[PDB]
């Protein structure tokens, strides 16, 4: 039986499946324990078992394959990879290994890999000849990711407004600055819908850190890609682990000339988590933020690039401001001028119940001429001149009213001309 489909099976069905095999008292233990118990019984029959996951190499030398279903959480169902296999096939952390599995033997508490037949969705002998991510050449974004869907729906207004303000291209390093109640979550969900609809080829990953347990559930329901999250009740080390697994997995896919998009929520919480784990260096900034603590999030955020060869890595990370914490202000200060794209949400517009609460004047992108055509860019400049005198609340109300009556951005530009 395939392991990946076993984890996707609901726990209630596993109990029915487990009791059919004859296992007992499996209804009072966690789902990961149930999966491990079921596999051992099926392994006794001698049948082959197939598993897959994302490799994580511990400091000792051995590695574990962890599934994205449980957000790469350590558990009994994880597959042990011997240090010899990590050298037999040149494997780095984040590689997706698929192959046969064998039951644990005496002294072994985990399942073990048996025969690798797929690495990074490719043959094992072809995945050892891929140039490392660090050796690739960064470039400015030049391929446009169009959020507009064109269906004329009300939810499509957020995508259309986003295109006018801050165009997003492959390899962009975006940064969404949001006050606490500006509807940040709805903005991210709308972006994910556009990505999954307009660009089905791009690999979409959503990373949530210090998120409420109920918020994690809704994301997995309405996001067509892959959602990995760590709830706020987990240790700060767990927040670091999930972030490391996501970025390393994204890098491996880019080495195979794939477009990977990561929607991070939020860079502030991720930086705060690194502040706890990283040992003190003696230079403490205001708010208790260690100087070396911010180095790791910069590595995560700085990986967003447009590779000169095939493939790209897009990272759109939200930031939290005026939350009442001095630590948040310091973190946002260090990330102020590091992103190619900045999108500002305004609390004042959110108070008037006008969505999206986007501050048009303070939001834009660098080198936007590369993303868009000459004719479209010229029209965009005309719109900015009109918006510039108006205030933040006035501009958004004016913008949506002139945008609702048109079903496409191109039609809106033609109407605005006359």
């Amino acid at each position: 039986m395939n392991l990946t489909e076993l984890k996707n099976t609901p726990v209630s069905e596993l109990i029915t499946l487990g009791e059919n095999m004859g296992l007992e008292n499996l209804a009072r233990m966690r789902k990961q324990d149930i999966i491990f118990a079921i596999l051992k019984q099926h392994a006794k029959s001698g049948e082959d078992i197939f598993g897959d996951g994302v490799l994580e190499i511990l400091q000792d030398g051995f590695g574990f394959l962890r599934s994205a279903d449980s957000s790469y959480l350590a558990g009994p169902d994880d597959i042990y990879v011997s240090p010899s296999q990590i050298r037999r096939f040149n494997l780095r952390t984040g590689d997706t290994i698929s192959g046969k599995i064998r039951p644990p033997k005496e002294g072994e508490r985990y399942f073990a890999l048996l025969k690798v037949n797929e690495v990074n969705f490719d043959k094992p002998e072809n995945a050892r000849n891929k140039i490392l991510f660090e050796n690739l050449t960064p470039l400015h974004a030049n391929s446009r990711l169009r959020m507009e869907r064109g269906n004329g729906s009300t939810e499509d207004l957020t995508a259309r407004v986003l295109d006018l303000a801050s165009p997003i291209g492959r390899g962009q390093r975006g940064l969404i600055v949001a006050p606490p109640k500006a509807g940040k979550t709805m903005l991210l969900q709308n972006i994910a819908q556009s990505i999954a609809y307009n660009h089905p080829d791009c690999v979409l990953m959503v990373l949530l850190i210090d998120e409420r347990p109920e918020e994690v559930t809704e994301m997995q329901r309405l996001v067509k890609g892959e959602v990995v999250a760590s709830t706020f009740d987990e240790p700060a080390s767990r927040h670091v682990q999930v972030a490391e697994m996501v970025i390393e997995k994204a890098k491996r896919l880019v080495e195979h000339k794939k477009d990977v998009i990561i929607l991070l929520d939020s860079i502030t919480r991720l930086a705060r988590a690194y502040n706890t784990v990283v040992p003190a260096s003696g230079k403490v900034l205001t708010g208790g933020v260690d100087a070396n603590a911010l180095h790791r999030p910069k590595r995560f955020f700085g990986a967003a690039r447009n590779v000169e060869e095939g493939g790209s890595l897009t990272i759109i990370a939200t930031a939290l401001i005026d939350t009442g914490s001095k630590m948040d202000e310091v973190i946002y200060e260090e990330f102020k001028g590091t992103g190619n794209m900045e999108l500002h949400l305004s609390r004042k517009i959110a108070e008037k119940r006008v969505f999206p609460a986007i501050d048009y004047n303070r939001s834009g992108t660098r080198k936007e001429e590369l993303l868009t055509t000459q004719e479209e860019l010229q029209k965009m400049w005309i719109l900015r001149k009109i918006i510039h005198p108006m205030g933040e609340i006035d501009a958004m109300e004016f913008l949506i009213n002139k945008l609702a009556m048109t079903k496409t951005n191109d039609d809106f530009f033609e109407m605005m001309k006359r």
Partner: protein, 82 residues
């Protein structure tokens, strides 16, 4: 002629034998039995290779050509056909 990689369990045992430098009993597909000391595991042109020496034989042979091996302290291991 296409190389078929062996199972991970078999590779680990051979590498453990190579590190320990034990006098394994090697028999090939044709059935040629010989006792030599394992030295190291190497790969060339995406083909895994094993170098075993018996009284300075230092011969080189493919992994898939080996059918089974045994030791007084390590149980006999039969490699999978695929």
């Amino acid at each position: 002629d296409t190389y078929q990689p062996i199972n991970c369990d078999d590779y680990d045992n051979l590498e453990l034998a190579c590190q320990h430098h034990l006098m394994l009993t090697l028999e090939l597909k044709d059935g040629e039995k010989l006792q030599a000391k394992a030295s190291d595991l190497v790969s060339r042109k995406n083909v895994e290779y094993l170098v075993v020496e018996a009284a300075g034989e230092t011969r080189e042979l493919r992994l898939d050509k080996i059918t089974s091996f045994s030791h007084p302290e390590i149980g006999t291991v039969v490699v999978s056909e695929s």
